[PDB]
């Protein structure tokens, strides 16, 4: 039973991802997050034993093998009108959107560390056959003591494929111009676009584009002092033509990405 295994705490948030409560696993006081998703809102479904579960459960299981920069699904339950997902909860934690709001534009050394860990997390998803489709600062949690970033909210994701995607329910201001223009995109190159938006967000303090005309226009104005190397990487990730964007390997080999801090160094220098 779900009610006897977990002590439920305050609501942490609610939105397109459902309703998420703080919780504690009774058997060992492990901090958890308890996420409720209404069945009537689940668009894409999957099978595990063939049990019909939300695709989000399928994707979380595929990536929750071992230790990584992805939120770990510990358990899940079916209720009459909803599914309940138990996720491991870092503590203390702050999501990257609130972090950037409070700190402003991030020093490039800190943006490099954060961006590197997000790249490693997204590579892990893709290695496991999972496309997140909603990479953004709001969907990244910072473990403030360990200096580790965790990707959350796979509810807009999909199985990774090499053919074209023609559906999308992620965040429009992180979506690529080929989606805006043609309602078509491929998984990896669209992911790289959202990563370019995320990196601009980190080093400038907010995302570059709010409107469709800006997304498709292909001009990146820098509102903060940003190094030439970082600017080049951002503009490369935000190439209008998807085939002009870097691979994950080219991103991580980029000159701006070298000499990344370890997670614990990042915490000690920037977070503690």
């Amino acid at each position: 039973p779900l009610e006897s295994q977990y002590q439920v705490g305050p609501l942490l948030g609610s939105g397109g991802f459902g309703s998420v409560y703080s919780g504690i696993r009774v058997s060992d006081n492990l901090p958890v997050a308890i996420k409720h998703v209404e069945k009537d809102r689940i668009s894409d479904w999957g099978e595990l034993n063939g049990t019909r579960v939300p695709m989000e459960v399928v994707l979380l299981k595929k990536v929750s093998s071992g230790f990584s920069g992805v939120i770990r699904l510990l358990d899940w339950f079916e209720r009459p009108d909803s599914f309940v997902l138990i996720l491991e909860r870092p503590e203390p934690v702050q999501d990257l959107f609130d972090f950037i709001t409070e700190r402003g534009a991030l020093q490039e050394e800190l943006a490099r560390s954060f961006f590197w860990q997000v790249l490693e997390a997204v590579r892990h998803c893709h290695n496991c056959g999972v496309l997140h489709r909603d990479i953004k600062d709001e969907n990244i949690l910072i473990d403030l003591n360990r200096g580790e970033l965790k990707l959350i909210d796979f509810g807009s994701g999909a199985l990774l494929k090499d053919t074209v995607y023609t559906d999308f329910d992620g965040t429009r201001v992180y979506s690529p111009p080929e989606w805006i223009r043609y309602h078509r995109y491929h998984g990896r190159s669209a992911a790289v676009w959202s990563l370019g938006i995320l990196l601009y967000d980190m080093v400038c303090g907010d995302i570059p584009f709010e409107h469709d005309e800006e997304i498709i226009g292909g001009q990146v104005f820098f509102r903060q002092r940003v190094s030439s190397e970082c600017q080049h990487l951002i503009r490369w990730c935000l190439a209008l033509r998807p085939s002009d964007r870097p691979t994950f390997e080219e991103i991580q080999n980029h000159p701006w990405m070298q000499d990344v801090l370890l997670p614990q160094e990042t915490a000690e220098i920037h977070l503690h």
Binding site: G15, K136, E138, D169, T171, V173, D206
Partner: peptide, 9 residues
């Protein structure tokens, strides 16, 4: 300049 969250799903 107004920074805001953006919905998804």
């Amino acid at each position: 300049r107004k920074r805001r969250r953006h919905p998804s799903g």
